[PDB]
Ligand binder design. Sequence first.
Ligand SMILES: CCCCCCCCCCCCCCCCCC(=O)OC[C@H](COP(=O)(O)OCCN)OC(=O)CCCCCCCCCCCCCCCCC
Ligand SMILES: CCCCCCCCCCCCCCCCCC(=O)OC[C@H](COP(=O)(O)OCCN)OC(=O)CCCCCCCCCCCCCCCCC
Ligand SMILES: CCCCCCCCCCCCCCCCCC(=O)OC[C@H](COP(=O)(O)OCCN)OC(=O)CCCCCCCCCCCCCCCCC
Ligand SMILES: CCCCCCCCCCCCCCCCCC(=O)OC[C@H](COP(=O)(O)OCCN)OC(=O)CCCCCCCCCCCCCCCCC
Ligand SMILES: CCCCCCCCCCCCCCCCCC(=O)OC[C@H](COP(=O)(O)OCCN)OC(=O)CCCCCCCCCCCCCCCCC
Ligand SMILES: CCCCCCCCCCCCCCCCCC(=O)OC[C@H](COP(=O)(O)OCCN)OC(=O)CCCCCCCCCCCCCCCCC
Ligand SMILES: CC(C)CCC[C@@H](C)[C@H]1CC[C@H]2[C@@H]3CC=C4C[C@@H](O)CC[C@]4(C)[C@H]3CC[C@]12C
Ligand SMILES: CC(C)CCC[C@@H](C)[C@H]1CC[C@H]2[C@@H]3CC=C4C[C@@H](O)CC[C@]4(C)[C@H]3CC[C@]12C
Ligand SMILES: CC(C)CCC[C@@H](C)[C@H]1CC[C@H]2[C@@H]3CC=C4C[C@@H](O)CC[C@]4(C)[C@H]3CC[C@]12C
Ligand SMILES: CC(C)CCC[C@@H](C)[C@H]1CC[C@H]2[C@@H]3CC=C4C[C@@H](O)CC[C@]4(C)[C@H]3CC[C@]12C
Ligand SMILES: CC(C)CCC[C@@H](C)[C@H]1CC[C@H]2[C@@H]3CC=C4C[C@@H](O)CC[C@]4(C)[C@H]3CC[C@]12C
Ligand SMILES: CC(C)CCC[C@@H](C)[C@H]1CC[C@H]2[C@@H]3CC=C4C[C@@H](O)CC[C@]4(C)[C@H]3CC[C@]12C
Ligand SMILES: CC(C)CCC[C@@H](C)[C@H]1CC[C@H]2[C@@H]3CC=C4C[C@@H](O)CC[C@]4(C)[C@H]3CC[C@]12C
Ligand SMILES: CC(C)CCC[C@@H](C)[C@H]1CC[C@H]2[C@@H]3CC=C4C[C@@H](O)CC[C@]4(C)[C@H]3CC[C@]12C
Ligand SMILES: CCCCC/C=C/C/C=C\C/C=C/C/C=C/CCCC(=O)O
Ligand SMILES: CCCCC/C=C/C/C=C\C/C=C/C/C=C/CCCC(=O)O
Ligand SMILES: CCCCCCCCCCCCCCCC(=O)O
Ligand SMILES: CCCCCCCCCCCCCCCC(=O)O
Lengths: 401, 401
Amino acid sequence: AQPAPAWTTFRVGLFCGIFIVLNITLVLAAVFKLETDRSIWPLIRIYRGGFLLIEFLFLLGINTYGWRQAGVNHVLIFELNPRSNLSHQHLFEIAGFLGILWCLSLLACFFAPISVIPTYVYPLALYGFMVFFLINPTKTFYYKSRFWLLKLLFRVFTAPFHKVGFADFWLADQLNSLSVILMDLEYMICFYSLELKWDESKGLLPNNSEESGICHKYTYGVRAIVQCIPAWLRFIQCLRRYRDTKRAFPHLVNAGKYSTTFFMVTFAALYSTHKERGHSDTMVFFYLWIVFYIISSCYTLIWDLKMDWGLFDKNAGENTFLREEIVYPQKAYYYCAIIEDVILRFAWTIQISITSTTLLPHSGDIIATVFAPLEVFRRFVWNFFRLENEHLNNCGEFRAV
Amino acid sequence: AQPAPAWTTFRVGLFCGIFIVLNITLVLAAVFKLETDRSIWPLIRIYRGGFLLIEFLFLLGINTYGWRQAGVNHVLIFELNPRSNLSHQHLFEIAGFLGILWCLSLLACFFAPISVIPTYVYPLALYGFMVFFLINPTKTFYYKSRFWLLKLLFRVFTAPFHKVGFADFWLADQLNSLSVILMDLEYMICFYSLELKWDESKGLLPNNSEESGICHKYTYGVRAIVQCIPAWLRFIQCLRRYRDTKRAFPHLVNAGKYSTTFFMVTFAALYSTHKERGHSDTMVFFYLWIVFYIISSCYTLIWDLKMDWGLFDKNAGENTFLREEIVYPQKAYYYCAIIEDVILRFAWTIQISITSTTLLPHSGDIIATVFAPLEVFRRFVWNFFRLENEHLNNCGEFRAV
Ligand SMILES: CCCCCCCCCCCCCCCCCC(=O)OC[C@H](COP(=O)(O)OCCN)OC(=O)CCCCCCCCCCCCCCCCC
Ligand SMILES: CCCCCCCCCCCCCCCCCC(=O)OC[C@H](COP(=O)(O)OCCN)OC(=O)CCCCCCCCCCCCCCCCC
Ligand SMILES: CCCCCCCCCCCCCCCCCC(=O)OC[C@H](COP(=O)(O)OCCN)OC(=O)CCCCCCCCCCCCCCCCC
Ligand SMILES: CCCCCCCCCCCCCCCCCC(=O)OC[C@H](COP(=O)(O)OCCN)OC(=O)CCCCCCCCCCCCCCCCC
Ligand SMILES: CCCCCCCCCCCCCCCCCC(=O)OC[C@H](COP(=O)(O)OCCN)OC(=O)CCCCCCCCCCCCCCCCC
Ligand SMILES: CCCCCCCCCCCCCCCCCC(=O)OC[C@H](COP(=O)(O)OCCN)OC(=O)CCCCCCCCCCCCCCCCC
Ligand SMILES: CC(C)CCC[C@@H](C)[C@H]1CC[C@H]2[C@@H]3CC=C4C[C@@H](O)CC[C@]4(C)[C@H]3CC[C@]12C
Ligand SMILES: CC(C)CCC[C@@H](C)[C@H]1CC[C@H]2[C@@H]3CC=C4C[C@@H](O)CC[C@]4(C)[C@H]3CC[C@]12C
Ligand SMILES: CC(C)CCC[C@@H](C)[C@H]1CC[C@H]2[C@@H]3CC=C4C[C@@H](O)CC[C@]4(C)[C@H]3CC[C@]12C
Ligand SMILES: CC(C)CCC[C@@H](C)[C@H]1CC[C@H]2[C@@H]3CC=C4C[C@@H](O)CC[C@]4(C)[C@H]3CC[C@]12C
Ligand SMILES: CC(C)CCC[C@@H](C)[C@H]1CC[C@H]2[C@@H]3CC=C4C[C@@H](O)CC[C@]4(C)[C@H]3CC[C@]12C
Ligand SMILES: CC(C)CCC[C@@H](C)[C@H]1CC[C@H]2[C@@H]3CC=C4C[C@@H](O)CC[C@]4(C)[C@H]3CC[C@]12C
Ligand SMILES: CC(C)CCC[C@@H](C)[C@H]1CC[C@H]2[C@@H]3CC=C4C[C@@H](O)CC[C@]4(C)[C@H]3CC[C@]12C
Ligand SMILES: CC(C)CCC[C@@H](C)[C@H]1CC[C@H]2[C@@H]3CC=C4C[C@@H](O)CC[C@]4(C)[C@H]3CC[C@]12C
Ligand SMILES: CCCCC/C=C/C/C=C\C/C=C/C/C=C/CCCC(=O)O
Ligand SMILES: CCCCC/C=C/C/C=C\C/C=C/C/C=C/CCCC(=O)O
Ligand SMILES: CCCCCCCCCCCCCCCC(=O)O
Ligand SMILES: CCCCCCCCCCCCCCCC(=O)O
């Protein structure tokens, strides 16, 4: 736990200050300099994924700080290099720099500094820069960390061909809580495929003001698939883990849990298409979707509250509705975590459903763009206690001990 | 040389980022959203003193960093408490925060967020907040440092009543290089007394576009006195030190060096009024002012090069035109310091002259606003080398050794 250099602290402070001032400027520009004749929704949907990634990186930095200060040995659990581990300052710095890029791109999109440069390339430029940062072969910007992330992501995406370590499962679950990022990426690529109107200078902000685009409606069904990939990877990873251990509890339980949200997305897309054609069984399929929503959300909430966190232990004794031993300084943190998780499981499931072409009016987009940051926050608070429990008592039989 | 807390470095980074983004926004606002029908010169003259104070604080933080790393024991020389001295991080922090305040005030002056609140009260708020932070009796914001600065300010301004320590001489010389700050403060008082037209909402920016105000002209002569006051303090401090030590070399020589500038500004202002009323002795008094220009500037340049820095030492040996022993890593730094002092020791006297209504065209204000930061930079370099020389060879007979 070597302290970070003062230069890194200065850099993260600089990035945070630039980010907060740029965000205040963004809010002021949105309040003052914006056109209501053109639909700002494509811009919001495109930049929502980037904003969620920035929030996830910042919350992960907070997670690393809390882990290293509480006592949980995250570097041992993640199997990272003890000497080359990344401090929370580095994660904060990366989040700040990427937020700088995101805010600059959004400001450029709001009012184009250059008339020649179209406003529809700024999101493309920002995401291309992000992906280049992720793939950059030159060993300048966190080359060890970036290469480890690239290798682990490649391993995760090839779920059934490698043994599921803790880190692979961890990032797969993070993606399970970051389905909005991939879904917005799919929306962006299809939108670029069809509805930019390259001739238009403000093509990314259509002047129709009424949402009737082919990509806005998810009747094609690709939205459902790209929403199930985060669950698909976890499902097959847990199946491979079961094949490795030949132990049903909890591997088949996890497979069932992820199939609940698989059927969630499939049913939501199907009955949304059914409603779009006004067929009589729309109400029956909506009922099947509501009961599947309830069972899936309850399943994930109970598992997160019982096995992932480890709470509600019978051997707790003094600790009410908790474990026998705790690492974090206050039990009120644990309690508020339980209520937060309870509400945000419902929030996560309803966000999945509503973005799965359920609520066509603009209120659906508002509430989804509101709930996605809440989903990332819930994943961060879940990560806290998941890592703490993993250190305390080995769950999921990852380590030999 | 104790390292600063990590949160202090984070704070200086945050302030640096906020300041750089606010400065970029200020430049953009000046380029795009600015009215040319109204004279912006009063605004520039009011905010120039604050900007120069920010620059002086930042360069003083650089001063402290260079002193600590080079080896010169500045805390012993300044007679500060060894266990409570301020690192360069604290100076950077306060410079950044005051720059944040200045940039916010300037931006709000550019476009008033509130129509009810007049645009001319913003400089009042900024400078009142600065002075309140300077007089703040509550022991929250650098109470030890602020109280020591207040006590030493009181000692310096009442020069002939206490012994001249190194710190008193040091700050008096700083003020001698910061005459523009007091000049602009006096301009603020006179402007606020006469040329606001309180009824006008934008009274801080008159719509005349032709500057003929009573304050813009300096026929009254109070500008001359507020230009002499720092040199007045230095001259009387040197006389008091001579009375204490009864030694002519260099106390009377220093008195002459700090006294030539009184006649400098006298001749400048008197010739300005003489040309304004257009008598015949204007050319004769201009010749007198130029010869006194030359002699005063040469006096200051040679003393800075010979006794303050200690350069051109006969016992130098290998070091060409330098001291025998040098602390700073490179002699090229010394040489570039000599060149910079030679160049800017000529222009700073011009800076005194122009603000004595010697160049009534707008070019005078442009060149003054450009040269005052250069004067502060010259004083920063002089502080570097004066402290370095003082540590090596006791100059001015301050310490007993
Ligand atoms: C509307 C306008 C926009 C508003 C939102 C603007 C968001 C800006 C970006 C988020 C804020 C980033 C800045 C805060 C995190 C960085 C803090 C930091 O570096 O603190 C230094 C601190 C001291 O170091 P130490 O713990 O001694 O040693 C560390 C060993 N490497 O070391 C540490 O890092 C440890 C202690 C701090 C870490 C825990 C707390 C960090 C987060 C606190 C909340 C920050 C604000 C969150 C956003 C609120 C609004 C949405
Ligand atoms: C170095 C690290 C830190 C960087 C910090 C950068 C901070 C930038 C903050 C910008 C804040 C804007 C402040 C605006 C002040 C008021 C200006 C105003 O009211 O006018 C808007 C101005 C003129 O436009 P308009 O109104 O059409 O003209 C009217 C004619 N009188 O409109 C303008 O053209 C002025 C504003 C232009 C701002 C454009 C910034 C875009 C970002 C630059 C990069 C673009 C590409 C980024 C892609 C990244 C991909 C990796
Ligand atoms: C398409 C869907 C995408 C979904 C999100 C995927 C990425 C999520 C963010 C990264 C995942 C977190 C990684 C683990 C964090 C917690 C553990 C930790 O702190 O690990 C430390 C690790 C240092 O590893 P180290 O010790 O150097 O490796 C062995 C050295 N021989 O260092 C790390 O923490 C590794 C982190 C890598 C560097 C930070 C991330 C770089 C920026 C990513 C940009 C992604 C662009 C996305 C574009 C599409 C957006 C719509
Ligand atoms: C166009 C729009 C306007 C753009 C410009 C706006 C204004 C920009 C403001 C400039 C930035 C202010 C502060 C920058 C330096 C701060 C560095 C810092 O605090 O880093 C901490 C660093 C590490 O600490 P360490 O030396 O290990 O030990 C310290 C012992 N207590 O400790 C140190 O401090 C030591 C290392 C740095 C100290 C020497 C260098 C300081 C100054 C660097 C140049 C700053 C920019 C100058 C102007 C550039 C443009 C002309
Ligand atoms: C705390 C740390 C963080 C600080 C962050 C800094 C925040 C301020 C950053 C300013 C950035 C400006 C960005 C401008 C974006 C584009 C806006 C634009 O083009 O319009 C200007 C807008 C409306 O004005 P106008 O154009 O006349 O209206 C047209 C009607 N449709 O005009 C506006 O009203 C928008 C711009 C308002 C900026 C006002 C800032 C004033 C500062 C607040 C305090 C004021 C008092 C300070 C006193 C200090 C004393 C110590
Ligand atoms: C009207 C004309 C004004 C002209 C300028 C006057 C101010 C000049 C700038 C401050 C002077 C610097 C003082 C010495 C700096 C170099 C030496 C150094 O670093 O000293 C460290 C010293 C530590 O002090 P400490 O240890 O507390 O003292 C012993 C404890 N018994 O701590 C310090 O460095 C003390 C510094 C004090 C705090 C910084 C300054 C506070 C802000 C001042 C605002 C002024 C407002 C002006 C308004 C008018 C503008 C037009
Ligand atoms: C990334 C940091 C430096 C902030 C970005 C600021 C720079 C890159 C931006 C801000 C305002 C921009 C200018 C705004 C307007 C015009 C007019 C036209 O002729 C196109 C270019 C030009 C001249 C832009 C050039 C780039 C510019 C100067
Ligand atoms: C959503 C509802 C309607 C159906 C699915 C929920 C039921 C059947 C399942 C889902 C998760 C399950 C829990 C998962 C893990 C454990 C830990 C084990 O040591 C005791 C049983 C216990 C506590 C299980 C009890 C039954 C359980 C709650
Ligand atoms: C319903 C909601 C708002 C309940 C509150 C949830 C949030 C605010 C709570 C839940 C868990 C909490 C965290 C639990 C553990 C840690 C690590 C510790 O070293 C510092 C506090 C910190 C970082 C807590 C911060 C606040 C926190 C994130
Ligand atoms: C110091 C930091 C927080 C930056 C300052 C930002 C805040 C305080 C400023 C920036 C822009 C400002 C707004 C600009 C314009 C108006 C319109 C009018 O009805 C007066 C108030 C109101 C609504 C202002 C309220 C305060 C405001 C929101
Ligand atoms: C306008 C400019 C030239 C300033 C005029 C005053 C100058 C020339 C005068 C004023 C006081 C004078 C000093 C008074 C006393 C002595 C002591 C003597 O043993 C050596 C010369 C020395 C040190 C003088 C040098 C010249 C001096 C500094
Ligand atoms: C701070 C003081 C004691 C420094 C010593 C120099 C004094 C005596 C000098 C310096 C500059 C001089 C002023 C320069 C110009 C003018 C304008 C003229 O129309 C009347 C005289 C008057 C007002 C002078 C009075 C005397 C003066 C103030
Ligand atoms: C151009 C004229 C009018 C002003 C400057 C020249 C004359 C008067 C004086 C003013 C201050 C003087 C210097 C003051 C101190 C020293 C150090 C001493 O050990 C050798 C002489 C030396 C280096 C002097 C040389 C001559 C000098 C520069
Ligand atoms: C030719 C002229 C105009 C150039 C201007 C001179 C400037 C750039 C020079 C003069 C003195 C120099 C400083 C002298 C000593 C130090 C201390 C060292 O530890 C870091 C560099 C630092 C802080 C130097 C930075 C550059 C510097 C400020
Ligand atoms: C922790 C919670 C995080 C929440 C962050 C919030 C982000 C922004 C929120 C909502 C987006 C705002 C939308 C308002 C715009 C509506 C379009 C109307 C005009 C049109 O239809 O043309
Ligand atoms: C280290 C160097 C620092 C330099 C700092 C200087 C920055 C810019 C300088 C001066 C400001 C320029 C203003 C241009 C025009 C002003 C008034 C024109 C309108 C009128 O006449 O009504
Ligand atoms: C956008 C202008 C910023 C101006 C200030 C620059 C701040 C970053 C300086 C980085 C210098 C590189 C040294 C890295 C050393 C290290 O990380 O150990
Ligand atoms: C304008 C919003 C800023 C948000 C971030 C706040 C940054 C400063 C937080 C200061 C916390 C207290 C640190 C104390 C450490 C010390 O005593 O040096």
